[PDB]
């Protein structure tokens, strides 16, 4: 923003005015005054780093401008406006951030690094990467059954199209010690909920194959072979293949079953079929026969599986709180709060003090509130919000102002001497689940040069 | 919702990443007491 | 997906660090851990 004091009616001041604005939200409602206008009407300028050298800048258009003629005992402590030179002023500070960070709630409440991690896990999460996925043949992809737009949010999200394609779920969290399974960074997750469909996800994979050609006319072929000279086939059960050498969508494939029958003539039946990767298992979902420039039969098959949260599976909030499940329990065994409610998650209290991620702590309060009021809480970067400012709102609702609640030990039903910080929190289900890593071997494929066990769990290696 | 900005070569969606290329600047530095060199001026030279 | 689109790379004198000039142009917290940390940045 440009500040040029050229205001014959006082001190220095922003060239843009509440009129320019209302004249913008006027174009907003119609979904003629664009960005290009604010620029060709000299009110905003494109300042690189070099020029930035020779200018001064204001943080907030207000606070850092008017006069000085009382101050909240809860908010933060911002310095002063000791200067009447301000050439320009920042639209908003939270614009120093980048894509990733802009999802992190209350980032201005975390040990600097705790954000740096969360700026790498949000990339290992699951959601909806597009909406045309029911029509995409990309190798590997995860969709979260029931996505939920996070309770706690950031004004920055509106442009990151978040409320349209989220990547997690607002789960009724419970920070406490229980069985002892949520220990050292892993949670106890309500099974019940897991059943009612919590965190269930989809998993699509898709193999591919063409019909290689040779100028001197020799062609591979999509058929359903069987012995007849060569013998070189596959262990899998061919039986599932139709005649075109493809599995029809409805089928339930598993082990090393065949998915594509193909043959290569050599001087007669050498196989080139594609079997479902040894470990996976599921249901076909969509095949498709196409041509590729050279006139080759091109074919992509896609298999879909539904993965349920299990015990080894990894999870995480939005504060580098990565942790995995240790055990699932049911409402019977689950610790409950008189109201009736019970948690979906149960992270151990210890994972806080040294991580020093209070933001995560706050999101709970902000969400437990906007969960009742239904007013999409705002947890955007540096703003005018407080903890005190919320404890008031939660109190206006009947539940203790700090979040805690009384709860009764599910096994007996006796009260829990202490109280637990209970309430929602967004949690991302990041890929990398257990049954995709569990791996064992007692002799098997052996390398050829070395004669030592082969590498990778994929090849049965050691 | 797709925002493009990437290409589509032999099937796959390829993204060209920004290639950064501070440099060309003079600075003087005091060196530890245990050393023959007193001060030095550096400059990272590189073709834009 | 977005994030990946706004990414930056930097071959090979204290780069990795977070510079002042880096303010407002590049993100301060978004960068890969270890290895090539601070060589790859996000706008």
């Amino acid at each position: 923003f440009i500040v040029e004091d050229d205001e014959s009616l006082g001190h220095k001041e922003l060239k843009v005015r509440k009129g320019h604005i209302a004249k913008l939200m006027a174009t907003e409602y119609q979904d003629e005054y664009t960005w290009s206008s604010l620029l060709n009407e000299g009110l905003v300028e494109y300042i690189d780093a070099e020029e930035e050298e020779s200018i001064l800048i204001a943080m907030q258009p207000e606070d850092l401008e008017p006069a000085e003629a009382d101050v909240d005992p809860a908010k933060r402590i911002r310095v002063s406006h000791h200067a009447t030179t301000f050439t320009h002023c920042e639209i908003h500070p939270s614009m120093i951030l980048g894509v990733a960070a802009s999802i992190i709630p209350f980032p201005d409440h975390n040990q600097s690094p705790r954000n740096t991690y969360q700026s790498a896990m949000g990339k290992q999460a699951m959601g909806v990467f597009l909406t045309n996925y029911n029509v995409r043949m990309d190798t590997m992809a995860n969709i979260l059954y029931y996505p939920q737009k996070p309770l706690g949010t950031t004004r920055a999200m509106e442009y990151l199209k978040f409320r349209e394609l989220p990547a997690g779920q607002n789960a009724i969290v419970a920070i406490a010690c229980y069985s002892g399974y949520n220990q050292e960074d892993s949670m106890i997750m309500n099974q019940s909920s897991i059943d009612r469909g919590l965190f269930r996800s989809l998993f699509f994979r898709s193999y591919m194959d063409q019909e290689k050609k040779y100028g001197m006319s020799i062609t591979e072929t999509f058929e359903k072979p069987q012995r007849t000279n060569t013998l070189r086939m596959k262990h899998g059960t061919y039986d599932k293949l139709d005649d075109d050498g493809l599995i029809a969508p409805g089928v339930r494939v598993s082990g090393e079953d065949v998915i594509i029958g193909k043959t290569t003539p050599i001087s007669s039946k050498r196989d080139a079929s594609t079997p479902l990767r040894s470990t996976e298992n599921g249901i076909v979902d969509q095949v498709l026969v196409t041509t590729n420039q050279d006139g080759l039969k091109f074919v992509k098959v896609r298999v879909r599986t539904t993965k349920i949260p299990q015990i080894g599976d990894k999870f995480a909030s939005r504060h580098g709180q990565k942790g995995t499940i240790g055990i699932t329990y049911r409402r019977e065994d689950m610790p409950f709060t008189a109201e009736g409610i019970v948690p979906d998650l149960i992270i151990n209290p210890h994972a806080i003090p040294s991580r020093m991620t209070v933001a995560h702590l706050i999101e709970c309060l902000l969400s437990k509130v906007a969960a009742l009021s239904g007013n999409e809480g705002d947890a955007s970067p540096f703003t005018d919000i407080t903890v005190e400012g919320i404890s008031k709102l939660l109190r206006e609702h009947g539940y203790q102002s700090r979040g805690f609640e009384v709860m009764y030990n599910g096994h007996t039903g006796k009260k829990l001497m202490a109280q637990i910080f209970f309430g929602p929190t967004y949690y991302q289900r990041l890929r990398h689940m257990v049954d995709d890593k569990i791996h064992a071997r007692a002799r098997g494929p052996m390398q050829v040069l070395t004669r030592q066990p082969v590498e990778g769990r994929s090849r049965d290696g050691g | 919702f797709d925002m493009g900005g990437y290409f589509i070569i032999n099937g796959s969606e390829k993204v060209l990443i920004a290639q950064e290329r501070a440099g060309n600047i003079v600075q003087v530095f005091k060196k530890a007491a245990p050393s023959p060199i007193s001060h030095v001026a550096e400059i990272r030279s590189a073709l834009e | 997906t977005l994030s990946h689109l706004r990414r930056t790379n930097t071959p090979i004198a204290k780069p990795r660090q977070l510079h002042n000039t880096h303010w407002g142009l590049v993100c301060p917290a978004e960068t890969p851990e270890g290895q090539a940390c601070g060589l790859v940045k996000n706008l």
């Binding site: 001041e13 922003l14 843009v16 005015r17 509440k18 009129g19 604005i21 209302a22 004249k23 913008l24 939200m25 174009t27 907003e28 664009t34 960005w35 290009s36 604010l38 905003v44 907030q60 258009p61 207000e62 401008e65 639209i91 908003h92 614009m95 894509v99 004004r155 509106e158 442009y159 990151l160 005018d384 | 925002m3 493009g4 900005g5 990437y6 060209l16 920004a18 | 977005l2 689109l5 706004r6 706008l43």
Partner: peptide
């Protein structure tokens, strides 16, 4: 008064306008 100050909440409106024309992918495009 189409020529008075500008409070916090206002700024957003602008930013909104920014991405309206720009898009998070400007760079790559332009």
């Amino acid at each position: 008064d189409e020529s008075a100050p500008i409070t916090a909440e206002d700024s957003w409106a602008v930013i909104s306008a920014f991405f309206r024309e720009k898009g998070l992918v400007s760079q790559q495009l332009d």
